[PDB]
Ligand binder design. Structure first.
Ligand code: AGS
Ligand code: ADP
Ligand code: MG
Ligand code: ZN
Ligand code: ZN
Ligand code: ZN
Lengths: 79, 563, 490, 73
DNA sequence: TTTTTTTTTTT
């Protein structure tokens, strides 16, 4: 869908970029389960790496400079 | 107190009423008393008087029509309501319309100055749009409100016009009348837009356009993509929002095709074999009986192209067309064949396409780099006047049942080659947009010319690697003509000779039989048969399909775009 | 004489001819047997009253047979003959069922198949105010709005209700000055005594391939009143029968520059034209060998593939959508996914299942969910149904599965294992239902399926999607001499 | 507003205690002060008010005749 | 608050 971490997408109405907090910002203290750890989008995998590193997601792009606290638990399954 | 005799109008009405009865054809037998016969059965209300005969019978009159055609039109129609009372079965409040034709002298959409308003002209152009048909109020019957009387016969002029005087000395509302609508007089009204024809465009100019207004039984003669020839009067029209600003409008009365392929009057073999003039029919027969015909149409259609004898044949078989069938379930088999050309630079590709598009009638020509998706197939446009989204016809539609010539087919974008495949497959065009839902027919045959990837055609690869079309499209053609410039020398003498001949004897050295006008006739005739298959031919066909698959068989050789 | 020298509209409006017509219709209603000695309008009125329907059908041909003069008066001035026939059928029913006054106290007579079927582009000004029968697809429908029928205002200075004016569908009704306090002013309606009636507007347009031969398809408006509303949905093929009524519009006059009026069909009878005992089926099912006999009944033309015939037949009837007692929600839909090189009648397998099945829809993959749309008629920004909610119980035929977009792919998988969609769109947050069986066909990469790799490679599809399909048929090809004749000959 | 009170503009005449009708229906301010044509305005200080929401009700899923999108009120 | 065409910044 939108992704795991946040994205910056060109809104049809605004014609400008908006911020999409994905799953790891909606899970507050909860737990996130993942499968096929090589299928996730390259950008998305980079961002999940940083999110498990720092425990927050901070995108600095076209018109977006915000921070979202990621507080969840990763239960990953590899292949 | 009483009204004034518009003498120049009534004298003309009288002389026209006389002409209608006195003028007779080659064998006595007054002709405007038999064409005016069918004028009684419902839905017919226009008599078509030729203008050259009104020149024979009289000449002090023609110069009154052709100079006051708007003053004296409301009278040349009453003088047809009296001449037709001799039938007694017409509803007494029905009204008729005179429609001229065959004017001597033509004009151009750029010669329509403002010194022409109110006269009788004649115009030729294409047709771009066609709005829907409407009723229009010509003479309202205002039911008075306080008197309960009926104010009657009030003429509108581009507005509702609300006549405000009553013949009753006690009319409490000289500003209020509820008109009825079951006695008033309506006439149909269609408004189309025409665009300057091709052969008149001054070089380096964008074509102009004007509004014509068909207003009678003539209301759906012109359709989009046609090349009709209108004959009416130029009028001025106000801006009714503030009733100033005026704008020109053509008010056509008759409309007819510009060059009839059969000059009788304008759909099977007999309906057409009737209009065939004696020489026409003794020539078409002669050709149909001709042997080696299949080699005198090539030599007579493309007279300035040395060689490629296997491409002209395909182009011909594309022009004649196959048999279109409809399966009982509701589907439909494609009837016409599509053809693509692919070759080295300067091998006469665009010349086949230009030949076909200048010969054939109703065949359109487009390049690939300067087109669109919504321009080929069909568009959606917001008419703010009606403030609605309506459908605009595209190049694949205003060439219907003809040929669409696409040059440089592989320059089109990735998304513009998709809309064309969606049409080439189902022979239709779907539209699903703002407020529009429709399915349109498209039975065109496509003739496309393309270029191999990286200039030259490499003869060690399949086709799919030499051209950048999609995968589905390359399946919907089923005739390819790969041209190559084999570096030879006996040809490089022949082509040289032919080109220098053509350039030295500009209009001669072209000795084709079957002049181009004649082939159009033969091709409009022979395109109305539906040949069948005999059992022996069916056996032959299945055997040939057997003998074609196995050539592609494994081991010995290889070919491109597998069978 | 029932025909004198006046206008047909004004002949019937006179008291004499009115009463004559009134009494003439009763004698036909009461006494009309049809080839068996059955008073058809005795059993038919009954079957109407056993349902509380207040709508009576009058086949036109029999009216012409038993009545020579009315069936010629009718399509000339039908705004009054269809009013007189109402009061006739009333007094008939209130005699066959004297208590029916407690059910709607008003009867409308429809009329079935006038002999003058017509096109939708050939309506000219000759037909203003004349009964008409046409045909064509319907492409819109507003909601069933209530319209005033017998309005009744109340004065603001006297607490007295004005006269019960009737509402005509061309001009807002205009009350005069209060006959009790002469307080001419802006009155307001009185919601308690006013009578209302249903209302719906549709836009009919020419059938796709019927008459639209070499031109664009025209359209028209229609107005369905009380009993008729919701007789047809966008996509249906109907055949109206209604007065062709015009009315003045001020906008068209300001666009075309000439006095031009709008037209609309006040529909009077809507009869759809679409697709709608066991004792044989007992032994036919008890043949014990109905399998072979049914397999070669689907795929009627396309030769071969008695393999995939089996799977698709399995899919068509379906299975059993049992509800597990452990709250696990197993699904009862069979989803199929064809695949194979181009030229093997996949698309035909889709199109024939479009026909044989019922309530089926269709789409290509090159609209899947409900989306906000500005209505053609109502001009409001409503929500319109997609392409997975129109198969909420039937089948969904997807074509060009590969050409789907990322949003389309992330939206298709949700409905497989959940069969339920949420829409938190600009319109409003809803959660609707979608129970459909998916029948799609993908393509092989490289223009040919090559069975060295697994199928999960030549399909070019996301891996957790193929799991959401039950059957995986692979169409393939080979140069085979003995079948070349078999397919060619066919 | 449930119990509203108005006032003239020029002569400053009041006509108070006016009661609105419930539901979604407004009110027709006089034009005959007893002063120019419509001299009446609302006095915001004296008007009793009550809350009101506006929901949107969709029909149950198992009662749609299954060809279309459910209707709402 | 919808198409369609054309230019320039952005993921
Ligand atoms: N076989 C031929 N016989 C006679 N004239 C020829 C022949 N081949 C080429 N010509 C002439 O050479 C020119 C060919 O140019 P075109 O046919 O317009 O270009 P083309 O074949 O479309 O190639 P490109 O890809 O578009 S440059 C024309 O002037 C032709 O008259
Ligand atoms: N075995 C067959 N029997 C009958 N028709 C066939 C057969 N194989 C191919 N066809 C023809 O091929 C067409 C189907 O092509 P299609 O499968 O739609 O191509 P694609 O899969 O590339 O869209 C049909 O219209 C049919 O006429
Ligand atoms: Mg070229
Ligand atoms: Zn008067
Ligand atoms: Zn009053
Ligand atoms: Zn005052």
């Amino acid at each position: 869908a939108a992704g795991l971490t946040a994205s910056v997408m060109r809104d049809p109405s605004s014609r400008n970029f908006i911020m999409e907090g994905g799953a790891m910002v909606l899970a507050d203290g909860g737990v996130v389960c993942i499968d096929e750890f090589d299928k996730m989008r390259e950008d998305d995998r980079v961002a999940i790496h940083e999110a498990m590193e720092q425990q927050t997601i901070s995108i600095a792009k076209a018109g977006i400079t915000t921070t979202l606290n990621s507080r969840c638990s990763v239960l990953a399954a590899a292949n | 107190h009483l009204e004034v005799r518009d003498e120049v109008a009534e004298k003309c009405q009288k002389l026209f009423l006389d002409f209608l009865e006195e003028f007779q054809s080659s064998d006595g037998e007054i002709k405007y008393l038999q064409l005016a016969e069918e004028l009684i059965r419902p839905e017919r209300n226009t008599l078509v008087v030729s203008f050259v005969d009104l020149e024979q019978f009289n000449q002090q009159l023609s110069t009154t029509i052709q100079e006051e055609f708007y003053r004296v039109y409301p009278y040349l129609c009453r003088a047809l309501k009296t001449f037709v009372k001799d039938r007694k079965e017409i509803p007494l409040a029905k009204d008729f319309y005179v429609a001229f034709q065959d004017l001597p002298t033509r004009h151009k959409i750029r010669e329509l100055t403002s010194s022409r308003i109110g006269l009788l002209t004649r115009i030729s152009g294409q047709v771009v749009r066609t709005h829907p048909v409407h009723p229009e109020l010509v003479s309202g019957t205002f039911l008075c409100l306080d008197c309960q009387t009926v104010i009657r016969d009030v003429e509108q002029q581009f507005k509702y016009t609300q006549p405000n005087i009553c013949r009753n000395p006690v009319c409490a509302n000289r500003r209020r009348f509820l008109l009825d609508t079951n006695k008033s007089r309506f006439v149909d009204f269609q408004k189309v837009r025409i665009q300057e024809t091709q052969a008149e465009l001054p070089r380096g100019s964008i074509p102009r356009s004007l509004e014509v207004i068909l207003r009678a039984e003539a209301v759906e003669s012109a359709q989009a993509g046609d090349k009709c020839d209108f004959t009416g009067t130029l009028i001025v029209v106000p801006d009714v929002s503030k009733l100033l600003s005026y704008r020109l409008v053509f008010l056509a009365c008759c409309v007819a095709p510009t060059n009839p392929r059969f000059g009788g009057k304008e759909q099977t073999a007999e309906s057409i074999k009737n209009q065939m003039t004696v020489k026409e029919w003794e020539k078409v027969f002669e050709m149909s009986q001709d042997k080696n015909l299949y080699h005198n149409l090539c030599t007579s259609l493309f007279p300035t192209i040395h060689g490629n004898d296997e491409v002209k044949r395909g182009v011909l078989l594309m022009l004649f067309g196959g048999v279109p069938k409809t399966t009982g379930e509701g589907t439909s088999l494609r009837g016409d064949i599509n053809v693509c050309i692919v070759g080295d630079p300067s091998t006469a590709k665009s010349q086949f396409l230009k030949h076909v598009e200048e010969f054939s009638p109703r065949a359109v020509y487009t390049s690939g780099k300067a087109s669109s998706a919504a321009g080929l197939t069909a568009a959606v446009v917001r008419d703010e006047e009606s403030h609605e989204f309506v459908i605009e016809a595209g190049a694949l539609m205003l060439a219907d049942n003809g040929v669409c010539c696409i040059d440089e087919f592989d320059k089109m974008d990735v998304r513009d080659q998709v809309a064309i495949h969606e049409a080439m497959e189902q022979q239709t065009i779907s539209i699903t947009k703002a407020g529009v839902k429709a399915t349109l027919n498209a039975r065109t045959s496509i003739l496309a010319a393309a270029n191999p990837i990286s200039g030259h055609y490499d003869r060690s690869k399949s086709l799919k690697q030499n051209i950048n079309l999609s995968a589905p499209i390359m399946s919907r053609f089923d005739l390819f003509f790969i041209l190559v410039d084999e570096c030879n020398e006996v040809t490089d003498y022949a082509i040289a000779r032919r080109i220098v001949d053509l350039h030295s004897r500009i209009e001669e050295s072209i000795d084709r039989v079957y002049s181009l006008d004649d082939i159009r006739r033969y091709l409009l005739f022979a395109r109305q048969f539906k040949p069948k298959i005999s059992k022996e031919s069916e056996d032959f066909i299945v055997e040939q399909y057997k003998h074609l698959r196995q050539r592609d068989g494994s081991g010995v050789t290889k070919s491109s775009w597998r069978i | 004489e029932d025909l004198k020298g006046h206008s047909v509209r004004e002949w019937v409006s006179m008291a004499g001819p009115r009463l004559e017509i009134h009494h003439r219709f009763k004698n036909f209603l009461r006494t009309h047997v049809d080839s068996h000695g059955h008073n058809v309008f005795k059993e038919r009125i009954s079957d109407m009253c056993k349902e509380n329907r207040e709508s009576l059908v009058v086949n036109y041909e029999d009216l012409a047979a038993r009545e020579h003069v009315l069936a010629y008066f009718l399509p000339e001035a039908p705004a009054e003959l269809l009013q007189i026939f109402d009061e006739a059928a009333l007094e008939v029913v209130l005699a066959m069922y004297p208590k029916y006054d407690r059910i709607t106290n008003h009867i409308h007579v429809r009329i079935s198949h006038l002999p003058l079927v017509e096109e939708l582009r050939s309506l000219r000004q000759l037909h203003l105010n004349q009964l008409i029968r046409t045909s064509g697809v319907v492409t819109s429908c507003t909601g069933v709005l209530p319209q005033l029928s017998m309005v009744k205002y109340n004065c603001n200075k006297c607490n007295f209700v004005l006269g019960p004016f009737c509402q005509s569908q061309n001009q807002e009704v205009k009350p005069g000055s209060c006959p009790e306090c002469q307080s001419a002013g802006p009155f307001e309606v009185n919601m308690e005594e006013t009578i209302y009636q249903n209302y719906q507007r549709i836009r009919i347009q020419e059938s796709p391939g019927k008459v639209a031969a070499g031109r664009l398809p025209r359209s028209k408006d229609a107005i369905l009143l009380a009993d008729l509303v919701d007789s047809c949905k966008p996509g249906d093929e109907i055949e109206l029968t209604g007065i062709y009524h015009n009315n003045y519009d001020g906008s068209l006059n300001t666009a075309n520059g000439f006095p031009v009026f709008a037209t609309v069909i006040l529909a009077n009878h809507v009869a759809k034209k679409d697709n709608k005992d066991v004792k044989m089926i007992t032994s036919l099912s008890k043949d014990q060998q109905i399998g072979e006999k049914i397999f070669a009944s689907i795929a009627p033309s396309i030769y071969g593939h008695e393999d995939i015939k089996r799977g698709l037949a399995l899919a068509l009837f379906g299975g059993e959508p049992k509800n597990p007692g452990g709250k696990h929600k197993v699904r009862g839909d069979i989803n199929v996914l064809l695949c194979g090189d181009p030229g093997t009648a996949k698309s035909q397998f889709l199109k024939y299942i479009e026909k044989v099945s019922s309530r089926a829809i269709f789409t290509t993959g090159q609209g899947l969910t409900a989306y906000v749309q500005r209505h053609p008629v109502s001009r409001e920004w409503t929500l319109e149904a997609g392409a997975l909610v129109l198969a909420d119980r039937g089948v969904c035929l997807i074509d060009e599965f590969d050409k789907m977009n990322d949003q389309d792919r992330t939206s298709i998988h949700e409905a497989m294992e959940q069969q339920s969609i949420s829409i938190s769109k600009a319109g409003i947050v809803t959660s609707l239902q979608a129970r459909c069986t998916v029948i799609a066909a993908a393509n092989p990469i490289g223009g040919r399926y090559d069975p060295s790799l697994t199928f999960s490679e030549n399909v070019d599809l996301t891996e957790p999607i193929i799991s959401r399909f039950d059957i995986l048929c692979v169409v393939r090809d080979t140069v085979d001499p003995v079948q070349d004749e078999m397919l060619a000959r066919f | 507003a449930t119990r509203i009170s108005i006032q003239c503009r020029s002569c400053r005449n009041t006509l108070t205690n006016i009661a609105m009708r419930p539901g979604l229906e407004g009110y027709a301010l006089p034009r005959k002060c007893n002063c120019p044509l419509d001299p009446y305005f609302i006095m915001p200080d004296k008007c009793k008010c009550v809350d009101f929401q506006t929901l949107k009700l969709q029909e149950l899923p198992d009662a749609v005749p299954h060809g279309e999108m459910p209707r709402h009120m």
